PDB file of C-alpha atoms and ligand atoms in Angstrom:
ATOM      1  CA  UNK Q   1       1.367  28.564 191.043  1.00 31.50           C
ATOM      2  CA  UNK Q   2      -1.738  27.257 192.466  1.00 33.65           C
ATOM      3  CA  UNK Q   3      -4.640  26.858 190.156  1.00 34.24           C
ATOM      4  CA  UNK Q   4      -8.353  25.466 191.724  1.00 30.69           C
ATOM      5  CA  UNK Q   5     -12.023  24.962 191.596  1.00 28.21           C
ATOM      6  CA  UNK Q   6     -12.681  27.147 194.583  1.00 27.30           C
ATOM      7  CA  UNK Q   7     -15.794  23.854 195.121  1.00 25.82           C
ATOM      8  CA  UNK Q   8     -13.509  21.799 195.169  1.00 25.65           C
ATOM      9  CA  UNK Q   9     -11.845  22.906 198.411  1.00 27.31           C
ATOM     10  CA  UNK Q  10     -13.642  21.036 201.211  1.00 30.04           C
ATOM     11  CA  UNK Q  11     -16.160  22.782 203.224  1.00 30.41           C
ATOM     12  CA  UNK Q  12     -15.600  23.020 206.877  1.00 29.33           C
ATOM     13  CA  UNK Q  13     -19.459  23.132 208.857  1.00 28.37           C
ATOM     14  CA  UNK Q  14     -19.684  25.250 211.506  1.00 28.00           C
ATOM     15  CA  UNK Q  15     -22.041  25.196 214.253  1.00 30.57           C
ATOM     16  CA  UNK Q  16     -21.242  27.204 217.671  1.00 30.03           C
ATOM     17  CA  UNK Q  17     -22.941  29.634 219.762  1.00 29.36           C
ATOM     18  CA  UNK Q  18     -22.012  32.283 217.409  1.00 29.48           C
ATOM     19  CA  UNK Q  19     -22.376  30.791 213.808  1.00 27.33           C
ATOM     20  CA  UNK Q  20     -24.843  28.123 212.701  1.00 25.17           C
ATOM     21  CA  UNK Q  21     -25.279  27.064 209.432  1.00 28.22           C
ATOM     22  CA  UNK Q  22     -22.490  28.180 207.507  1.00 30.00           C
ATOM     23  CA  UNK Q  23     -19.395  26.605 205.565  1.00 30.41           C
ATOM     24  CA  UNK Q  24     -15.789  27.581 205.458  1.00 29.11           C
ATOM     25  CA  UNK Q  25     -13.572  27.135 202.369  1.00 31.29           C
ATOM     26  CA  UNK Q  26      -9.823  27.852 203.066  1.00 29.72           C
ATOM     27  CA  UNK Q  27      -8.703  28.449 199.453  1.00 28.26           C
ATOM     28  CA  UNK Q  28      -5.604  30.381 199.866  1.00 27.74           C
ATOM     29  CA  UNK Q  29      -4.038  30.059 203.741  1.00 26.58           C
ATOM     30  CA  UNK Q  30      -1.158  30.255 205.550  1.00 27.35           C
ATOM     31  CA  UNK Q  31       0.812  27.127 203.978  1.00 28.45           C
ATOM     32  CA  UNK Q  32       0.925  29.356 200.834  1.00 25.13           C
ATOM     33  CA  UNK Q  33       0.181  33.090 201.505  1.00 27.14           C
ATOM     34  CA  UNK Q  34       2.739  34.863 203.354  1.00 30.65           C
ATOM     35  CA  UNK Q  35       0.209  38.294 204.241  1.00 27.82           C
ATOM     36  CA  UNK Q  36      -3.377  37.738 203.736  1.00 30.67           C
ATOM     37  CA  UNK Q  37      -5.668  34.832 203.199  1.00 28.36           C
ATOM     38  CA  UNK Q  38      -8.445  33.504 200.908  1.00 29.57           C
ATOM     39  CA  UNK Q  39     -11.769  31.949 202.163  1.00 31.32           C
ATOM     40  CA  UNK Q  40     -14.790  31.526 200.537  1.00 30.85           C
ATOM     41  CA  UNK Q  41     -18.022  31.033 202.997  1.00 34.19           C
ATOM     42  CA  UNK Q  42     -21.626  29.665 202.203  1.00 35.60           C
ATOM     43  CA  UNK Q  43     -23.915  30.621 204.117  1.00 35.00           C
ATOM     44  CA  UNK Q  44     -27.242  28.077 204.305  1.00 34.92           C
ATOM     45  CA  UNK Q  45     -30.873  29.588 204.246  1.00 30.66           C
ATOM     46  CA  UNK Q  46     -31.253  31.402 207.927  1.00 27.94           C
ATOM     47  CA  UNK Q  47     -27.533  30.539 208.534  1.00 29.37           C
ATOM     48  CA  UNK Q  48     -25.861  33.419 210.907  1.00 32.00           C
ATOM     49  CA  UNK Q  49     -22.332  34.478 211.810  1.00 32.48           C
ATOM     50  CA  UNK Q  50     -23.499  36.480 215.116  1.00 32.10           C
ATOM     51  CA  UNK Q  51     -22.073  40.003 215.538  1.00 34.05           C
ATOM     52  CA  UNK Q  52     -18.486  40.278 216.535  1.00 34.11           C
ATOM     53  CA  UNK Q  53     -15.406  42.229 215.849  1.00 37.36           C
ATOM     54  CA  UNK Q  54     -11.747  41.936 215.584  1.00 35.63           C
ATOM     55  CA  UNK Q  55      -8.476  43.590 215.302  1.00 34.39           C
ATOM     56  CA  UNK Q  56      -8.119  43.355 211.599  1.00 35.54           C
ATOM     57  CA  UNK Q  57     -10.075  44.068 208.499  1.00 34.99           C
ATOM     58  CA  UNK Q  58     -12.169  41.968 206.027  1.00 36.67           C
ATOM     59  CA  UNK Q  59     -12.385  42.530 202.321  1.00 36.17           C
ATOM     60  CA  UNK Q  60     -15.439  40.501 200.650  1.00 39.98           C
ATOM     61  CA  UNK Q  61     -17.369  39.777 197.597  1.00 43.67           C
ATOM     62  CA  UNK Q  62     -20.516  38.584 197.366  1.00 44.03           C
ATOM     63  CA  UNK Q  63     -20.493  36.043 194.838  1.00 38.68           C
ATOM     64  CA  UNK Q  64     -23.932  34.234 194.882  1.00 39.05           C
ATOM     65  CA  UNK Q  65     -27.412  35.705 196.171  1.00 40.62           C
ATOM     66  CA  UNK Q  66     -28.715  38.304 198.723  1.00 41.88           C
ATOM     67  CA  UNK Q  67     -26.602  38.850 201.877  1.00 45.43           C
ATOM     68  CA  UNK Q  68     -27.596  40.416 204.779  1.00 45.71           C
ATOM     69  CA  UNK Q  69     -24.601  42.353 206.363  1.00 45.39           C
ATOM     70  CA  UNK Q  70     -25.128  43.177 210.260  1.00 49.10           C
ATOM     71  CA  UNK Q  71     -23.796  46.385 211.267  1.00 46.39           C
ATOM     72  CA  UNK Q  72     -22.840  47.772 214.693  1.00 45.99           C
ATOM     73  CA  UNK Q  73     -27.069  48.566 214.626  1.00 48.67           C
ATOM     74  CA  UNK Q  74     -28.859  47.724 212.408  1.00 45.93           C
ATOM     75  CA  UNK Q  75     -28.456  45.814 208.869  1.00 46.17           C
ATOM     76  CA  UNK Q  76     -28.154  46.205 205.161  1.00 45.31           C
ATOM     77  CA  UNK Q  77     -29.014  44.237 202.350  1.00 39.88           C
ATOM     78  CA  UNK Q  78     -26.819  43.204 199.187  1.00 41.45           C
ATOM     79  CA  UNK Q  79     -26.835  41.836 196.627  1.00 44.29           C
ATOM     80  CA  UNK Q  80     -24.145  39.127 194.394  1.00 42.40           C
ATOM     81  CA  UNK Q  81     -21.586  41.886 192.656  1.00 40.51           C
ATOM     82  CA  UNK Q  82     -20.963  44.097 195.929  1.00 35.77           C
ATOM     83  CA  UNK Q  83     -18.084  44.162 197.524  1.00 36.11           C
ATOM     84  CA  UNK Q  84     -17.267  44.822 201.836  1.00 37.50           C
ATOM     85  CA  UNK Q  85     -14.605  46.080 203.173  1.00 37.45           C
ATOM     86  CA  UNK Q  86     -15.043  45.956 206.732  1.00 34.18           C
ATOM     87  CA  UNK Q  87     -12.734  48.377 208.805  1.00 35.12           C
ATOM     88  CA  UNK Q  88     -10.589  46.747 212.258  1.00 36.87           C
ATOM     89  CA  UNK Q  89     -12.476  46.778 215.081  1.00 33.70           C
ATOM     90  CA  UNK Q  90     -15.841  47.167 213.379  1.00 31.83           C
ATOM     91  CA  UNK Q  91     -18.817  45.432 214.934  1.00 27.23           C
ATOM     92  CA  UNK Q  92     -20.260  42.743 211.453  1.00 24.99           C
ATOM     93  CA  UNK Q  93     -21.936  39.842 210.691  1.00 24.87           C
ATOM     94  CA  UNK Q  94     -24.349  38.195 208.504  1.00 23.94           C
ATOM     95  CA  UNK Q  95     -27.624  36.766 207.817  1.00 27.59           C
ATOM     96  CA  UNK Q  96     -29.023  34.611 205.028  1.00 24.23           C
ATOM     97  CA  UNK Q  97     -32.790  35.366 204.769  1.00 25.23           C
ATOM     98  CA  UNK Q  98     -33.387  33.857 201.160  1.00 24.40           C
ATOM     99  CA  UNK Q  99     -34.412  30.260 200.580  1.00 23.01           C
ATOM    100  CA  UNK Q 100     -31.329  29.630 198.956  1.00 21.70           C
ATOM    101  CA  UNK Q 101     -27.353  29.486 199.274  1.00 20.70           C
ATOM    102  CA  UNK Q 102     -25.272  32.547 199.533  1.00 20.15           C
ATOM    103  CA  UNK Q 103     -21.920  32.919 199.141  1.00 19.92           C
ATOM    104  CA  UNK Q 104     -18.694  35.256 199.354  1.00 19.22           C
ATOM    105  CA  UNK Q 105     -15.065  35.278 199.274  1.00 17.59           C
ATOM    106  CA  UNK Q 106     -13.294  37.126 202.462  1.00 16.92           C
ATOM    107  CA  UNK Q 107     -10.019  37.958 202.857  1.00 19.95           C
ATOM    108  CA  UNK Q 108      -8.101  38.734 205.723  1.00 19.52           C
ATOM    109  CA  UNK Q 109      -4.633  39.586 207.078  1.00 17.44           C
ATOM    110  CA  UNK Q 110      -2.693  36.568 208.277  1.00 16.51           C
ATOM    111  CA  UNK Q 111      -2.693  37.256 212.106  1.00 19.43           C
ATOM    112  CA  UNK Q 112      -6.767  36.843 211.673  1.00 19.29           C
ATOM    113  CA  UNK Q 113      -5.096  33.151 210.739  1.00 17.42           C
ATOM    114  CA  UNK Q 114      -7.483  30.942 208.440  1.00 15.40           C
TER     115      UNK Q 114
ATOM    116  CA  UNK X   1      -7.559  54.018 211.647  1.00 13.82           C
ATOM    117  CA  UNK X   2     -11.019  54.992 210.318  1.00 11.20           C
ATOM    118  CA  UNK X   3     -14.106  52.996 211.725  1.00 13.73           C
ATOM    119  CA  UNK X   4     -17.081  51.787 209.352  1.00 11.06           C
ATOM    120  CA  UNK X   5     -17.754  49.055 206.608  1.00 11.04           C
ATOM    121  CA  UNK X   6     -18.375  50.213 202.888  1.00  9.08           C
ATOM    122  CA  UNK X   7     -21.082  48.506 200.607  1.00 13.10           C
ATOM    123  CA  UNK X   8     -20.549  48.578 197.322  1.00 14.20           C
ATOM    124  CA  UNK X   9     -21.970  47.525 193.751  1.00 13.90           C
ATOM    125  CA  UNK X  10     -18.264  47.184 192.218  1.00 13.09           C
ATOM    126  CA  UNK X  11     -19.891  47.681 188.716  1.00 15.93           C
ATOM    127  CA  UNK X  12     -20.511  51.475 190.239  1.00 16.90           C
ATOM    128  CA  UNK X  13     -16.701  51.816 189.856  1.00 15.83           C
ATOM    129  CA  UNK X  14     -15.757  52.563 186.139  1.00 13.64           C
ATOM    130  CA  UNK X  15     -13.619  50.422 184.493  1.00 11.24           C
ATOM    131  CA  UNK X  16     -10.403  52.280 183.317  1.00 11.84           C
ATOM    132  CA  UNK X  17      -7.984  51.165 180.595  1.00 13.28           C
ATOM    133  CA  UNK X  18      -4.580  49.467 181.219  1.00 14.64           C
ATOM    134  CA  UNK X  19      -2.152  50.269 178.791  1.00 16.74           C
ATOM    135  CA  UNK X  20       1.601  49.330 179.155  1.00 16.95           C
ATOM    136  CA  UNK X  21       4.348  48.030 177.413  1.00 15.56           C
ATOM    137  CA  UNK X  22       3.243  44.360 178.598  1.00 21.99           C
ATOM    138  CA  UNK X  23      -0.959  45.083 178.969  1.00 21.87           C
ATOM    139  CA  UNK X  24      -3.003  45.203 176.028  1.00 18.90           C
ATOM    140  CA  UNK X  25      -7.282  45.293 176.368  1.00 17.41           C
ATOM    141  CA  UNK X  26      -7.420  45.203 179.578  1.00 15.36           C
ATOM    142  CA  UNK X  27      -9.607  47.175 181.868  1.00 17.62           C
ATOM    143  CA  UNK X  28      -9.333  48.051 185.754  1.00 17.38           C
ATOM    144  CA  UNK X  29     -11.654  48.702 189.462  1.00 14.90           C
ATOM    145  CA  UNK X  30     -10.101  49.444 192.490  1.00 13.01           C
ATOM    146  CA  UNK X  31     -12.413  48.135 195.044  1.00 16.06           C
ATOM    147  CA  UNK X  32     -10.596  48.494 198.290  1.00 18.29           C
ATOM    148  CA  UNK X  33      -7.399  50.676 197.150  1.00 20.29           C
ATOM    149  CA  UNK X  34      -4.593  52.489 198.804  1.00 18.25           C
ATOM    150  CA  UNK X  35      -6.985  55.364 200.460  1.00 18.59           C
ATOM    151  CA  UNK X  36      -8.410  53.001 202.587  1.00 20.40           C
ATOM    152  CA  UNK X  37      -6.503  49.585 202.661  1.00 20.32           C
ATOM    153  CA  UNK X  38      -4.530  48.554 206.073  1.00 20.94           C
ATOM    154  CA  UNK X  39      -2.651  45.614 203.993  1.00 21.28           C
ATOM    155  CA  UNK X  40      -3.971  44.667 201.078  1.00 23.28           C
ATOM    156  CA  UNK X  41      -5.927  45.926 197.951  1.00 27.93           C
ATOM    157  CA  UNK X  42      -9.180  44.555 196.036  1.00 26.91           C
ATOM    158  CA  UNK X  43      -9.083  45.203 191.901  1.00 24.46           C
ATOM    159  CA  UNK X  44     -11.542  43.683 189.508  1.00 22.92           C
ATOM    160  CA  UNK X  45      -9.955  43.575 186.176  1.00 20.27           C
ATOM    161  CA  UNK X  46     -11.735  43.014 183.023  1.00 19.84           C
ATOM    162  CA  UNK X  47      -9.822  41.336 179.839  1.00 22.53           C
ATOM    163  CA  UNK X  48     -11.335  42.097 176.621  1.00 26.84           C
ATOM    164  CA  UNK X  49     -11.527  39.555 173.692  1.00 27.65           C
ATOM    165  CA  UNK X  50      -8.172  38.979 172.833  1.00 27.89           C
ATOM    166  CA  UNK X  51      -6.548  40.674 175.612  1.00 29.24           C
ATOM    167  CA  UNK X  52      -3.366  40.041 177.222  1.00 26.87           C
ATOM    168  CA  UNK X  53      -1.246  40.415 180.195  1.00 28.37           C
ATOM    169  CA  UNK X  54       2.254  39.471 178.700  1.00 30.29           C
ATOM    170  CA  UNK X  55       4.361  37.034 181.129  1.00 28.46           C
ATOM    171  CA  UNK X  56       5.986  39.101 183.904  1.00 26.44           C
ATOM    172  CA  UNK X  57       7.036  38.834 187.319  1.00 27.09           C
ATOM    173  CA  UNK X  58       7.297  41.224 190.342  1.00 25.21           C
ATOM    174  CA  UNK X  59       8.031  40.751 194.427  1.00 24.87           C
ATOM    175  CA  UNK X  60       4.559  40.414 195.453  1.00 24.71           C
ATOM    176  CA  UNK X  61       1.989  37.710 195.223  1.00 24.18           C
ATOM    177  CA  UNK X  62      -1.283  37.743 193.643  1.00 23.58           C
ATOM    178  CA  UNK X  63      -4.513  35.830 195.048  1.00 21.50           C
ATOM    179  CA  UNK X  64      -6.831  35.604 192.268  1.00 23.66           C
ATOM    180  CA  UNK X  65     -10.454  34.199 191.698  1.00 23.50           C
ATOM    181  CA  UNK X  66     -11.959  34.196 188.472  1.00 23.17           C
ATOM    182  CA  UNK X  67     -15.909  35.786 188.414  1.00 22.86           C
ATOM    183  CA  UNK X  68     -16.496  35.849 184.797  1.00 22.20           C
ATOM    184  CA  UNK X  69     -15.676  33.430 181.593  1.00 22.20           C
ATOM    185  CA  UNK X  70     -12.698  31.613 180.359  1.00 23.15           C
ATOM    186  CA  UNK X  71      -9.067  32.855 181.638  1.00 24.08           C
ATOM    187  CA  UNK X  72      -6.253  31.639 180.053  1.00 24.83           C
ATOM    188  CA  UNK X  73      -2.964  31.748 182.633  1.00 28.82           C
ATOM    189  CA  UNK X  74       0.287  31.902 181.353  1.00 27.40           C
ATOM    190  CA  UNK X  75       2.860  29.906 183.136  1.00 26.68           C
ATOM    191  CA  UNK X  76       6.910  30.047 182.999  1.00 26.40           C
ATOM    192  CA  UNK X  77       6.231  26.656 181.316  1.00 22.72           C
ATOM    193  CA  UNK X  78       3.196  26.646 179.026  1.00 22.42           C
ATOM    194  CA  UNK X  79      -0.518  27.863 180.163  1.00 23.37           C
ATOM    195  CA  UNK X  80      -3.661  26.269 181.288  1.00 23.93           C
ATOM    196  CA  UNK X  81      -7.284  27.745 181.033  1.00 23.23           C
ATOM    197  CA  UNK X  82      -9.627  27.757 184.243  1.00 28.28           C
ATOM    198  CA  UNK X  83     -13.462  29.702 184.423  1.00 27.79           C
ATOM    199  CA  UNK X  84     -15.852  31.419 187.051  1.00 27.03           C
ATOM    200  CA  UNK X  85     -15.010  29.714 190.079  1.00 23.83           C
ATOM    201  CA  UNK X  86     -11.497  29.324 190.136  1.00 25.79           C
ATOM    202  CA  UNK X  87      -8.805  30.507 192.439  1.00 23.76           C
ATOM    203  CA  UNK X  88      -5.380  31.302 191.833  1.00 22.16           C
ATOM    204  CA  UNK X  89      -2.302  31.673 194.107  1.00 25.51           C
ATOM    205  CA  UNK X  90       0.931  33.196 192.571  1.00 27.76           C
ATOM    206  CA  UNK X  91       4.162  33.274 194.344  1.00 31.70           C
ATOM    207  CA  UNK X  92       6.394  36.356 194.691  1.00 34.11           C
ATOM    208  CA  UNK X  93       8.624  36.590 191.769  1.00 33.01           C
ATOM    209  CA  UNK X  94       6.728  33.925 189.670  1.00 31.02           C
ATOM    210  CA  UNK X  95       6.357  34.225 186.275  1.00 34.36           C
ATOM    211  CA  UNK X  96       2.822  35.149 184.968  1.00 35.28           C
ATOM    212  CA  UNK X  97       0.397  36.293 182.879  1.00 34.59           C
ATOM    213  CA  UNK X  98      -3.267  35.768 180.889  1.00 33.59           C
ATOM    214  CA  UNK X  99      -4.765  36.133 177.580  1.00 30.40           C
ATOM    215  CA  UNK X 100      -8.524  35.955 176.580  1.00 36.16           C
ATOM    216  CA  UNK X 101      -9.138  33.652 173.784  1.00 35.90           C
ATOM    217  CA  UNK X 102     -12.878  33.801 173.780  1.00 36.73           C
ATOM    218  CA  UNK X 103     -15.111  36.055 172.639  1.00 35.44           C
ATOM    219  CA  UNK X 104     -16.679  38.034 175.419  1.00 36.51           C
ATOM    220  CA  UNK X 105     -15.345  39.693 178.820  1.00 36.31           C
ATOM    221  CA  UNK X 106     -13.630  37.603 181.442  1.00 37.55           C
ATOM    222  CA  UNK X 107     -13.517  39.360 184.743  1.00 36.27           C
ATOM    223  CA  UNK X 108     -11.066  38.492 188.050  1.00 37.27           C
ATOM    224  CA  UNK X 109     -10.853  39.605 191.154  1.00 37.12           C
ATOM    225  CA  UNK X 110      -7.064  40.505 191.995  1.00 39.67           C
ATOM    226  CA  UNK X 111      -5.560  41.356 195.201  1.00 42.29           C
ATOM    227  CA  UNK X 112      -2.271  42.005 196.378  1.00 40.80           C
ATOM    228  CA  UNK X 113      -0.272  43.300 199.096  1.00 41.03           C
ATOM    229  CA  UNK X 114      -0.929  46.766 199.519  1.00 40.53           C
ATOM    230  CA  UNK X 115       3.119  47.481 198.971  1.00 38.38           C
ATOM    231  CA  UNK X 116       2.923  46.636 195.168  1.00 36.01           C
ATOM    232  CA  UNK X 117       0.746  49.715 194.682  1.00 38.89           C
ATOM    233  CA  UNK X 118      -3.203  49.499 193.476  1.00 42.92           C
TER     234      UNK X 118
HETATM  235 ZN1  LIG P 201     -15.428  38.889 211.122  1.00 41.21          ZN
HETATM  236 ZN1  LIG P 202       1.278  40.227 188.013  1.00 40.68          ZN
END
């Protein structure tokens, strides 16, 4: 059994085309899970993870601050206490527009890898 | 299967009592349950003061992360206490289970393959 300070985990920065200032937290992957997998992502002020999709699902909680979710059009707002669940194949992403860190856990099936 | 994303204040979800042989003061939200799960469920479970999940174990994993207060996990060999912040990974068929030795709610988020139920 496996017991953590999900902080403690080191943060992997990413910066591409598609997602700029946001960190990755692997917390549970595939060394340990055998179906689905644990992150935890902070998302800077006017950090982005572009719209995208993908043959499998997320489930999310927003743990810290206001999160803008992008949808297929359009976007919604919310807040720390909501959870996502994102359907396969669904058009997402996200948007920090707050002067300060958000952050949520996101799980997904193992063939969406870590 | 079904297209969409669902947005959700899980506090909007009311919190039902668990009560079994091995469950005492323990309360329940299924955030992403069987209705709608491909794999795996969601469940934010609340342990009241002095609550407790007797040690058990079952063939499915649990991936845990603690939102609220002081959780005290129950090992095959002795326990250890984490907080808000904390994740926990337990393997299929290992042995289990939490108590709540403060005095106000402690709240987890609990998810498991969608096989071992909701
Ligand atoms: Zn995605
Ligand atoms: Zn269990």
């Amino acid at each position: 059994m496996i017991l953590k300070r999900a902080y403690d985990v080191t943060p992997q920065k990413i910066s591409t085309d598609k997602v700029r200032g946001v960190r990755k937290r692997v917390l549970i992957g595939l060394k340990d899970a055998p179906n689905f997998v644990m992150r935890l992502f902070t998302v800077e002020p006017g950090g982005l993870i572009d719209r995208h999709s993908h043959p499998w699902e997320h489930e999310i909680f927003v743990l810290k601050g206001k999160l803008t979710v992008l949808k297929e059009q359009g976007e919604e707002t919310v807040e720390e206490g909501f959870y996502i669940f994102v359907e396969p194949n669904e058009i997402h992403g996200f948007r920090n527009d707050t002067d300060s860190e958000v952050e949520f856990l996101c799980l997904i099936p193992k063939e969406g890898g870590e």
